[PDB]
Amino acid sequence: FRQENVDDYYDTGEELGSGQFAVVKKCREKSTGLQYAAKFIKKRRTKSSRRGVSREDIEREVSILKEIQHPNVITLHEVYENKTDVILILELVAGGELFDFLAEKESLTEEEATEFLKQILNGVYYLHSLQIAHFDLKPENIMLLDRNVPKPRIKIIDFGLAHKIDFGNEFKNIFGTPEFVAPEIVNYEPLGLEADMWSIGVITYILLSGASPFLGDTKQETLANVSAVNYEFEDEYFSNTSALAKDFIRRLLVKDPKKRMTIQDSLQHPWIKPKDTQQALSRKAAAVNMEKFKKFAAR
Structure with missing residues (x-):
């Protein structure tokens, strides 16, 4: 240097x-x-x-x-x-954190939310194409270049936990934030690109519902929720969420990494790339649970 x-x-x-x-x-x-x-x-x-x-x-x-x-x-x-x-x-x-920015809008449809989510997917696609796992994906490492433009550019930051995955998995530390880390991280098992996809699932879940899926009342319970993949689409937060979006999340919050949606698959998912107008309208008619999302973003 x-x-x-x-x-x-x-x-x-x-x-x-x-x-x-x-x-x-x-x-x-x-x-x-x-x-x-x-x-x-x-x-x-x-x-x-x-x-x-x-x-x-x-x-x-x-x-x-x-x-x-x-x-x-x-x-x-x-x-x-x-x-x-x-x-x-x-x-x-x-431009600050993505969620703080979205927190200022009066409302947000799922279609608008996917517009921002798609940028995260794009960054991660690039990283995973180069065999790079980020291993610390969470809302605070999703920033905006400039919060004062028509459509703000998302920036993925903090590569302090990132690893080249040369052998399909890596056997190390790699422990980030309880709330957003995959079960294999919690249970100290081998780690790969799929860990990132789990994290994407958690961010998405919060983005639409305002709720953290595996947040326990103590850190140890949080890790235990994660390990058991204990989450629900509670009607109180998801009653206005599309079935496509639910299906998107469900395919990422999968305990076995191997069964989990890949970044290539998530970019092709009909929630992200609707194959027909009915799907497109479905996503257009569903909304972010904005008043709880604002409360999450303010925590």
């Missing part, structure tokens, strides 16, 4: 986000005036240290981000590193 000082090439501004051993700050490149996001990642530095991120893990993230160029994924611009930190100079995604 680049061993020079960040601060000789960039000025930094306000913090944008912070993780356990990472902070994102807004920055501006001196030589072009272009603005970026700088993600400072703390290295643990010694293998036995537990106060940072494994440098190998950092390289993995960097290695993946350098390979991807796609409108619905964040771009990597430059990488710096000093004694304590590796700094990723990333594309600045300024």
Whole structure:
């Protein structure tokens, strides 16, 4: 990587986000005036240290981000590193989370919702085409480039858990957020591209109903709901949801990864690509449960 000082090439501004051993700050490149996001990642530095991120893990993230160029994924611009930190100079995604944005609309049909969902599917299609599992797909890693345009571009971010899947599966850690992680992750079994598809199912479920499907009253119950694939389409939230949409979700929230809809299949699903007008109208007439979705988005 680049061993020079960040601060000789960039000025930094306000913090944008912070993780356990990472902070994102807004920055501006001196030589072009272009603005970026700088993600400072703390290295643990010694293998036995537990106060940072494994440098190998950092390289993995960097290695993946350098390979991807796609409108619905964040771009990597430059990488710096000093004694304590590796700094990723990333594309600045300024528009905030997708769900906060959708939360401001007065209503939302399933057809409009699929317009945004389709962009997520597109990004993931690209990633999966390159054998890349994201492994941390959840509403907060779905951002907008700019919330002030006719049709806003979705940006998939945070590749901190992402892996190349060369052998159809990988046997590792890879544990993200209880609410959105597939059963095989919860149960520490081998992990593949299909984990991402489960996550897509959870996001979709929340997008239409405002409800989290496997959210227990404690974190441990949440993981247990997930493992058992214990979810319902409770009438209180789904009474205005299409059968197509329900069928879409049902084919992703499948315990066996192997049985789960692939990204190629989900892009071909009639909820996503209606094969006839009746299906098209069905999706047009169904609606997002907007008052509960707004409450979820505000949590």
